[PDB]
Scaffold this active site. Structure first.
Site, PDB file in Angstrom:
ATOM      1  N   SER A  48       0.784  -1.232   0.000  1.00 28.06           N
ATOM      2  CA  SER A  48       0.000   0.000   0.000  1.00 28.06           C
ATOM      3  C   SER A  48       0.819   1.287   0.000  1.00 28.06           C
ATOM      4  O   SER A  48       0.537   2.163  -0.806  1.00 28.06           O
ATOM      5  CB  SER A  48      -0.940   0.071   1.205  1.00 28.06           C
ATOM      6  OG  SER A  48      -1.749  -1.086   1.214  1.00 28.06           O
ATOM      7  N   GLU A  49       1.812   1.497   0.864  1.00 28.12           N
ATOM      8  CA  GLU A  49       2.539   2.762   0.881  1.00 28.12           C
ATOM      9  C   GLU A  49       3.379   2.972  -0.357  1.00 28.12           C
ATOM     10  O   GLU A  49       3.557   4.117  -0.790  1.00 28.12           O
ATOM     11  CB  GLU A  49       3.486   2.863   2.088  1.00 28.12           C
ATOM     12  CG  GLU A  49       2.759   2.802   3.403  1.00 28.12           C
ATOM     13  CD  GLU A  49       1.887   4.013   3.755  1.00 28.12           C
ATOM     14  OE1 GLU A  49       1.624   4.892   2.937  1.00 28.12           O
ATOM     15  OE2 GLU A  49       1.456   4.066   4.899  1.00 28.12           O
TER      16      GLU A  49
END
Ligand SMILES: *[C@@H]1O[C@H](CO)[C@@H](O)[C@H](O)[C@H]1NC(C)=O
EC number: 3.2.2.22
Length: 261
Positions: free
Chosen positions: A174-175
């Site tokens: 995700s990041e």
């Protein structure tokens, strides 16, 4: 839409870069964009979730389920004892819970719950992992692969290794999709373990601020100065979109129009 797979067991830089591109293109709202950076849809889109399947070198897998609107992990599943085992955070309840339960582990096949007995916020995960900060948890392709083997198919595993697997998987999937800079940190250290530097943690914590600032920028100028941090932890003052745009892969949804390009 398609389950996106990444094989951490037989990875190359190019395969990780393809995975980031695939994830960003499935997650983005196809219409929304500001200064040429794709934006995530808000909460009432057609498809609200994404599934990402990770494979270790042991050939065992874990599937993550992501909310499309902000790429937060809601839960994960693994093949266990000839059943689909689903693991959901203790604050996911009602309609989301059973959309998660039934999308990871379809009703028509055997399944069993193994709850995550805590929530998914970074403060929570760092305490369960036994660290003061997540920069004490190393990231890397080999570590992601080894962590999958430690959980997938195992009758017992500790909350410490699950919270460390979730700190590695949230930042590398995700990041990294939200930020091209964190994706470039994984490619730069592709053959080694490494600690997230201070610019990686600062961007993670300011994704919402950065997204509002860019959206409200007029002719490429930010509304007011944005104080971020450099790789070494020193202060970095951002005044224009083009100064932060190389580090950003996806915008959080911000309501209203913005300069598209
Ligand atoms: C979102 O933006 C639209 C378009 O400007 C506006 O009409 C609407 O009031 C906004 N919604 C919220 C919750 O502010």
């Amino acid at each position: 839409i398609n389950t996106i797979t990444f094989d951490a067991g037989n990875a190359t830089i190019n395969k990780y870069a393809t995975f980031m591109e695939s994830l960003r293109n499935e997650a983005k709202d196809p219409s929304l964009k500001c200064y040429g950076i794709p934006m995530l849809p808000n909460t009432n889109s057609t498809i609200k979730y994404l599934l990402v399947k990770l494979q270790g070198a042991s050939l065992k897998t874990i599937t993550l389920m992501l909310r499309r609107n902000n790429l937060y992990v809601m839960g994960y599943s693994d093949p266990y004892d000839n059943k689909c085992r689903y693991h959901i955070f203790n604050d996911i309840k009602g309609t989301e819970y059973s959309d998660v339960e039934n999308t990871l582990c379809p009703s028509s096949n055997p399944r069993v719950a193994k709850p995550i007995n805590y929530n998914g916020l970074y403060p929570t995960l760092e305490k369960k992992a036994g660290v003061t900060s997540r920069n004490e948890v190393q990231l890397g392709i080999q570590i992601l692969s080894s962590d999958i083997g430690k959980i997938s198919g195992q009758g017992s595993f500790t909350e410490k290794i699950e919270a460390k697997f979730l700190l590695v998987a949230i930042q590398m999937v995700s990041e990294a999709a939200r930020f091209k800079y964190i994706e470039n940190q994984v490619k730069t250290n592709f053959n080694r373990d490494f600690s997230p530097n201070d610019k990686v943690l600062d961007l993670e914590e300011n994704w919402g601020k950065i997204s509002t600032a860019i959206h409200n920028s007029k002719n490429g100028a930010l509304p007011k100065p944005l104080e971020l941090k450099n790789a070494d932890g020193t202060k970095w003052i951002v005044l224009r979109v083009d100064e932060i745009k190389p580090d950003v892969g996806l915008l959080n949804y911000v309501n209203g129009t913005c300069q598209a390009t």
